Design a protein around this ligand. Sequence first.
Ligand SMILES: CCc1cc(CCN)ccc1O
Length: 357
Amino acid sequence: FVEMVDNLRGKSGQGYYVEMTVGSPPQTLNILVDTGSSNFAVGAAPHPFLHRYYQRQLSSTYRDLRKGVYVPYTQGKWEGELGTDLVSIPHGPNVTVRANIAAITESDKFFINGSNWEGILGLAYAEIARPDDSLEPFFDSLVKQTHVPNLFSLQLCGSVGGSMIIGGIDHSLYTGSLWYTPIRREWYYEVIIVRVEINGQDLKMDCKEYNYDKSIVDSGTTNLRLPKKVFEAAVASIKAASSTEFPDGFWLGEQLVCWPWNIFPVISLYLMGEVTNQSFRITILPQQYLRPVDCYKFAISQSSTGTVMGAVIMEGFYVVFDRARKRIGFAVSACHRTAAVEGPFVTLDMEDCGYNI
Ligand SMILES: CCc1cc(CCN)ccc1O
C-alpha cells in the first residue's frame, strides 16, 4: 500500500483531505475525510472560498437523480442536487466506481476561507445518510462494485499530513498490536467506553454516562468531546492534577493560554473488547488535548451528542475501520511518557455502559 501512504494533507483544525477525481474526463478535487457522516458532497458552484469545484456540464458520465438534499448543522448548512458519476482516488486503489454525489449549490458556514478542500467524503453508514438510508454511501458502492475489501484505516499525523489506506492495513504505520472494539451499531462508528482514568485514577462514574447518547470515532471533528456530566468530572480532575498554575474560561474553550507538560495528566479510555468481560485501554498524552494555535487551546469540550473521539484522539493512533467484522482497531501510531494501547483488562457488566433509545 505504498501508493497510499502520505495521501492525506491538511491544516491544523481544518480537517484532513484526500485527492479525488470525479467525472469523465477526471476532475481533480480535494475532499475532506469524515467518519462522522455518510454523504459524498462536493462544491458545484463558484463559491469565493473555493479553489476548484465540481463542474457537471463537463462530464459525459454524470447522471441527474432529480432530487434535492438539505443538510443543516447548528452552525449553518449545505444544500445540493443529487446525481451519480465516476469516482477515483489517485492515491488509492486502481478502480473507478459509480457513486452518489451531492452537488453543493448553497452553503452557510460550511466551507472554510483559506482551506484547500472543496467537499466532504462521508465514510460512515447508510443509516445517517441524507435524505435517507437508500442513498448508498461512497464506501458501500466501492465494496459492492470492486474487489476492494470492506475496511479502511486512518493515520492522522498532526501543516498536517496522514494516510488513508483503502481496502487494508499497512503495518509500517503502527507499532505494537492492534486492539479491537466492536461497532455497536452501523450508523456512525459507534463504540462503547467502559472506564475513564485521569493520570491513573478512575472518574468513578456510572459507565452508562461516558456513552450518554453515544460514543463515536469521528475524523471530521477536531476535539475530544465528552458528555456534559463527564466533561465536568473530567475537567475538575485535570484541574486537581495540575493546580500548580488558569481562568475558568480556558476550560470552557472561551480563551487561550500561554507560556511544561508534566503537570498535565495522561487520559485513558478503556474500550469494550472483543471478548466477554475483556477490555483494553488507549492513553492520550497532553500533547494531544492541548493544541497549538506558545499559546494552546484546551482541545476537550462538552457535548450534547455523546462522546466524540475526534482528530485530537485519533492523531496518536492508527485506526482501523474494520467494517467486514464490525469492529474498530487501535494501535500506537508510527508518527505520534508515550501514547499507548494496552490489554487485556477485566471489566464486568460492559453491556450496561451502552445507552438505550
Ligand atoms: C473541519 C471543519 C468541518 C468539519 C465538517 C465535518 C462535520 N460532519 C464539515 C465542515 C467543516 O467545515
